[PDB]
Scaffold this active site. Sequence first.
Site, mmCIF file in Angstrom:
data_model
loop_
_atom_site.group_PDB
_atom_site.id
_atom_site.type_symbol
_atom_site.label_atom_id
_atom_site.label_comp_id
_atom_site.label_asym_id
_atom_site.label_seq_id
_atom_site.Cartn_x
_atom_site.Cartn_y
_atom_site.Cartn_z
ATOM 1 N N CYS A 111 33.207 39.247 39.096
ATOM 2 C CA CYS A 111 34.471 38.718 38.586
ATOM 3 C C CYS A 111 34.964 39.500 37.388
ATOM 4 O O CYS A 111 34.208 39.751 36.445
ATOM 5 C CB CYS A 111 34.271 37.245 38.207
ATOM 6 S SG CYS A 111 35.728 36.339 38.063
ATOM 7 N N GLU A 155 39.807 33.932 44.952
ATOM 8 C CA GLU A 155 41.057 33.864 44.207
ATOM 9 C C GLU A 155 41.618 32.444 44.084
ATOM 10 O O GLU A 155 42.032 32.024 42.986
ATOM 11 C CB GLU A 155 42.098 34.799 44.814
ATOM 12 C CG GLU A 155 41.729 36.264 44.701
ATOM 13 C CD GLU A 155 41.102 36.639 43.351
ATOM 14 O OE1 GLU A 155 41.564 36.168 42.269
ATOM 15 O OE2 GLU A 155 40.149 37.435 43.385
ATOM 16 N N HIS A 158 39.970 30.215 41.480
ATOM 17 C CA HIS A 158 40.475 30.418 40.119
ATOM 18 C C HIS A 158 41.639 29.498 39.759
ATOM 19 O O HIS A 158 41.795 29.118 38.595
ATOM 20 C CB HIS A 158 40.965 31.847 39.937
ATOM 21 C CG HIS A 158 39.898 32.805 39.547
ATOM 22 N ND1 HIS A 158 38.979 32.537 38.547
ATOM 23 C CD2 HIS A 158 39.598 34.037 40.019
ATOM 24 C CE1 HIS A 158 38.157 33.563 38.431
ATOM 25 N NE2 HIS A 158 38.517 34.489 39.304
HETATM 26 C C1 LIG Z 1 34.982 38.489 45.865
HETATM 27 C C2 LIG Z 1 35.982 38.256 44.758
HETATM 28 C C3 LIG Z 1 36.098 39.534 43.958
HETATM 29 C C4 LIG Z 1 37.007 39.300 42.757
HETATM 30 C C5 LIG Z 1 36.736 40.351 41.673
HETATM 31 C C6 LIG Z 1 37.906 40.387 40.701
HETATM 32 N N1 LIG Z 1 38.187 39.026 40.287
HETATM 33 O O1 LIG Z 1 37.596 38.626 39.170
HETATM 34 C C7 LIG Z 1 38.983 38.203 41.000
HETATM 35 O O2 LIG Z 1 39.279 37.045 40.749
HETATM 36 C C8 LIG Z 1 36.569 41.732 42.280
HETATM 37 O O3 LIG Z 1 37.517 42.321 42.776
HETATM 38 C C9 LIG Z 1 35.164 42.347 42.197
HETATM 39 N N2 LIG Z 1 35.263 43.799 42.284
HETATM 40 C C10 LIG Z 1 35.482 44.433 43.426
HETATM 41 O O4 LIG Z 1 35.586 43.820 44.472
HETATM 42 N N3 LIG Z 1 35.575 45.756 43.379
HETATM 43 C C11 LIG Z 1 35.821 46.398 44.495
HETATM 44 C C12 LIG Z 1 35.160 46.093 45.667
HETATM 45 C C13 LIG Z 1 35.458 46.797 46.821
HETATM 46 C C14 LIG Z 1 36.416 47.797 46.791
HETATM 47 C C15 LIG Z 1 36.733 48.515 47.931
HETATM 48 C C16 LIG Z 1 37.063 48.079 45.607
HETATM 49 N N4 LIG Z 1 36.743 47.355 44.467
HETATM 50 C C17 LIG Z 1 34.546 42.014 40.852
HETATM 51 C C18 LIG Z 1 33.048 42.252 40.931
HETATM 52 C C19 LIG Z 1 35.137 42.953 39.809
HETATM 53 ZN ZN LIG Z 2 37.246 36.370 39.808
#
Ligand SMILES: CCCC[C@H](CN(O)C=O)C(=O)[C@@H](NC(=O)Nc1ccc(C)cn1)C(C)C
Ligand SMILES: [Zn+2]
EC number: 3.5.1.88
Length: 185
Positions: A111, A155, A158
Amino acid sequence: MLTMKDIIRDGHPTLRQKAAELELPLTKEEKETLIAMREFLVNSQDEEIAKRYGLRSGVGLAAPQINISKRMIAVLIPDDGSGKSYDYMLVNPKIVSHSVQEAYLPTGEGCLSVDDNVAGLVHRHNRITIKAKDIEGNDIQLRLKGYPAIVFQHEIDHLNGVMFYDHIDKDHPLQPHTDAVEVLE
Ligand SMILES: CCCC[C@H](CN(O)C=O)C(=O)[C@@H](NC(=O)Nc1ccc(C)cn1)C(C)C
Ligand SMILES: [Zn+2]
């Protein structure tokens, strides 16, 4: 341009509130906000821009995470290899139905608002149907499975003041539920 300084961190009261439903049509400012949320995700996935602005890579962002207690989310999941990709800005998203069968990322989840990794499986529904409006107040119904279903649920959580680690079993954090589907990142 949003950057990490705009992301509020775990402990901030806004992340534990229940986000307010949007009136349609959105105000210009609300539209700009949601566009900037998506744009954060885009920049965070661009190796160069992310490097230049110290962005942590993300696939989802909810308005509460930038201290805006409104039911808007952005999801940006690039192509995995199957040709499926997800690029959605949703207003008042709602899970209207879902599978009984569960799914989990084998690594657990992370997150943007949480600095330290938390070990543990987060069980979610493998399939979900979402109804929402788009930025212009038009109707969207999504049928999602596996990885994108997990991201959208994260999402939407949240918006109800729920954090991923709320789902983690204290005593057996890494034991999968019977019949749950392991989802490859
Ligand atoms: C499952 C919910 C994830 C939500 C969370 C952000 N968030 O806090 C939302 O509310 C992310 O996006 C994670 N990072 C992530 O996924 N990075 C990623 C992964 C794969 C590819 C291709 C590119 N980037 C977090 C670990 C940062
Ligand atoms: Zn998150």
